[model samples]
Target: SPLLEQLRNSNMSLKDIFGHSLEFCKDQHGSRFIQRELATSPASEKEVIFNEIRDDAIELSNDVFGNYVIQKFFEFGSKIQKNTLVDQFKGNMKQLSLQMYACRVIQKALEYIDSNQRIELVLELSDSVLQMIKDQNGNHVIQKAIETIPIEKLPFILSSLTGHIYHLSTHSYGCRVIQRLLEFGSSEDQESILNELKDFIPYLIQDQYGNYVIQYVLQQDQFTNKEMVDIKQEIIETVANNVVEYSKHKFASNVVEKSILYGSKNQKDLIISKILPRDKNHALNLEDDSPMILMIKDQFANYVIQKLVNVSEGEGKKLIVIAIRAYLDKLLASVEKLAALVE
Candidate 1:
């Protein structure tokens, strides 16, 4: 009617929009109008929207234009209002997360819901979480679940991750979940996860997604796990011991960069020492050339060199700078194309 026209481009009171909330939610611009208003409206007005949209919440959740309204309700809705909307997704949590837009709402719900509701919601996905973790859209819900709610609250999630840690660490999406687990999940879970991760370091360090997990372990200062020190030591050995080899690779180079930055003081010394290794071997006749010149211009390896240059200090910094200077033109040629090589 004239009502749609009036509200389309003009101000309309919440009272005017209330009774037909479902209709507003289905329209493209009206849904955006609803979401924007939902952000600033009073608590009483929020209650009105909850009741107005209650019967149609599920429908709006799947609506192409209205799904964001569902998420905004979780953001602005009151305690009971949030719970009632969450209950609408009670048994369908797994399926909802698989939806392109509903997954966003589930993630938002995770942030605002109280612990009891969170536990209830997590329970719905517990049995299917692995599937969700591997799913493109569904993985976001689990990441948010663990991100907002701690590991202690999600024992089922913890238990399920037992042996899957390695496999997940290499997954496009599961890798994200494991990294989150390593970053904030239980220390004990991290221990087991790292242990599962140890034997696979060879593969993980080079995998497209797994390398990120390796970087997290190296980059994070989380000394909560007993094996972290040992695990880091292992990663340093694996990455640094073969720096010249992998530093040229696309994925392995990232792991090498992590080892260089987060490794201990002595570890840093050892890692940098591998960069050139100019002892000239045991024979005066030996004339082996160092790969330093090649690395200065390598696409992937140059980045590792840049990270090394950024943090190297005192003698290490001065020596690396001098060594790089010998091949200054090579670094310059590459520098003209990208960052670093200045300091």
Candidate 2:
């Protein structure tokens, strides 16, 4: 009782709770106390402490308070000490991965482990990649794998999505995994993903989740392949052909942004030309009801002109500035009217 009471009343060492590590881990203050202790403890003592709690690891994996202690140890514990805990994860992965708290611990484990251990552990999950991606708590574990696992070793995750790419790309959780692979996966994996997205751009560009994937790919300034260039050109042309129409869309407008942000220099200028009033009779006119005038007042397309403003140069930049100035007073007047309503 003296040792137990001192746990809160004063600072203590591992030996104070020596045999009672699990008991401390499962209690609220006790768990956080030990996690902080574990953080400051030397490696020798940390390994020694794992010896006390080793038998109860599975019990602690999902323990509401104990899980933090488990997670904390991984970060502070020595290499062998971390491996000691990962070994506890062996056959219990499916349940552990789906259990919210333990799922967090495993993602930590993925980050802390080396190749040999990482490869062996991920095998247990090979057949269930699709199931994991869509699960409420399991998706991050899958994304975590993509983040840490080598591209060559990522075949199973890629293979599992086969024809299922579209459905998952649009899924709330699965979209992150898709985007993760695009940024980190191999050349073939990148191409494989882009291949799935090729014919679907028109539809994906505006989807709630899929639009994000489209926007993500455009934002990457990575080295591009011939096929990659073709797809990007296709996306730019598609958006360029329908610049006004697409920019006015709620979600599609974001895709247009990345297009301007990453599109080739001439391509950016082309989009600028489209946004400007047509140079009919070799002279442009900002008609009172013109497209340029309508865009600045548009609920959604207003941002595209604003986006172009930041990127446009010389003559084009001034044209956009003049257009905005044409309506600045009205814009400010509308803001003052709305400001009074806020209070």
Candidate 3:
């Protein structure tokens, strides 16, 4: 009657009135509902009254009550309500990440071993924790958490995930979800999984040089003693073969580009040789009639022509040449100094 009367009033906002009444209702009624009487109530009836009240509080939470009201409501609610607002935020990515982080904090609240069904409760809650990670769409939060955790804890988590994923993969359901998780996994996690798998690959195959060849080998007491030199040689041979094949493809590209830049004939070669001189022994082999010799003579003639122009144009042209030559000489001297230091 009180809840209906307060809710029916047109003047009062439902949430504000709920806030005002819920506090009073909880205090006066205690854990019992209005329809449920304290006297003549069986233990089951009393339990049902509390369950209904708890469900009502959850409903209020789901409805997005004000912070003050949610806090007040949680005071008398179930243990689930302590973590209720967190579970209630499951779909919100940012809040969910924080909730996952909070669960780790609350883990200390759990006992070493439960006295009663608390053990089952802890296991069930732990499963919920894992499911929360699975349901979270954004991996950046998971990646950040993975990065901050201790190194020793990493292998335990990876082993658990690997076994879980492997089991899923072997089933008819297909490993698509696990594969997606692997794809979105942080680089460190991916490397850890690969290294773990690589440790076992040598034993699974014979003549380990074919298409499915393994590059990494493990030293186990039960396994044959594979020499370190043999393993090193195997790795080098495989890596070198891959590098050579990749280089061939790159070499083909280099040839095409060089042909475009240098032209079809030896014209590019002749120009380069005249501008950049070769060894004295090779210079004598030109027979003194080569294009290089002609190009050198042309260069000298151009120098002479520039000098004649400067003489005709007087101070203006002379000043320009002097300025350019001074700058060039300074630059060449610096280069010579750098070469001496490097040598």
Candidate 4:
């Protein structure tokens, strides 16, 4: 048992060795020895290392004893033939999930490097995962990985899917995972996530097909009724503040626009009809309290609006519409972009 423990620890240490090596290569020498080795190594040596590392990493991965080791192993591998290891793991992704869960290094590695080359690894990994889902016919591991994906780093994960865009768009599991991120993530994370999602929005927005599982999420009463309501509320508050700030830049008057901007004649009427009620006649009146404001209006919006107001004139009104449209269009575009890229 003591000897086995030593082997386990050593294996883990070696895995970290690979991780450190990768960092060192990138930062100091700008060369990936492991990557080079993986690329040029003879098939026999490649298979040997793949088997040896995979076995040790999997062992440490499945049990708590060697998660760091397994993580390091993958980190090391990522520096070297990322595609090779991704392929090897694809054939054995069930076990790979254990390793992925065991260590956060794999996710960190993906985030650390934002290049297309690194994203290639993620696509390969996606392929492996898809293969595993096909072979195993379940979603437990994928769900776990999605749960573990850091809210801040979600964009990188989505971006990684660019190479295998079909993975995000075609795979039901992948789409659901992205939707979950949008639903549960923080406001700061939402805009970035939405931007990444833009890649696939066109397909998702008009689709009657189920190929994009996230659309199913959108169609659900919960998303439309609950999540969409929350998201729209957040977007309105955010955009509302941005417009107010721009208004201040346009004027040198003693007073800044504190009221919300009604985009067009139609929008002003719509706002008046929908948002204003028996007791509320203005969009930004502090007296009229909504649950959406107490819960959804972010601190930043409050800060910006405190010093500003809507002051756009005739041409300014048209500019306001253009600005708001551009912002909304960008947000919508991100959803599709990310979905398509992930696909």
TM-score of each: 0.89, 0.89, 0.23, 0.28
lDDT of 2 by residue, 1-343 (tens): 4556776776578866777788888888888888888878887778777888888887888889988888877788778877888788888788899997888888888888777777778788889998999998899988888788886887888898888898888999989989898778767887888888899888888899998988877776537665667777778888888888788899999999889989888778877787774433222345556667766666677777767777787777766665555555443443333233322
Deviation from native of the Cα of residue 221 in model 1, angstroms: 2.7
Report the Cα lDDT for residue 192, model 3. Answer: 43
Comparing 1 and 4 on TM-score, the stronger one: 1
Expressed as tens digits, the lDDT of each residue in 153-174 for candidate 4 is: 3344444444544345445555
- The per-prediction tally of clashing pairs is 0, 0, 0, 33
Per-residue accuracy of model 1 over 169-257 as CA lDDT, tens digit each: 77788888888877786667778788887887878888999999888888766445678878888888887667787888899998888
Instruction: Give each model's whole-structure lDDT.
Output: 0.77, 0.79, 0.33, 0.38
Worst 10 residues of 1 by lDDT: 279-288
Each candidate: RMSD to true structure?
Answer: 3.2, 3.9, 21.1, 16.8
Give stretches of model 2 more than 4 Å off: 1-5, 279-285, 329-343
Clashing residue pairs in candidate 2 (N, C-alpha, C atoms within 3 angstroms)? none
lDDT of candidate model 1 versus the reference: 0.77
lDDT winner between 1 and 2, please give it.
Answer: 2
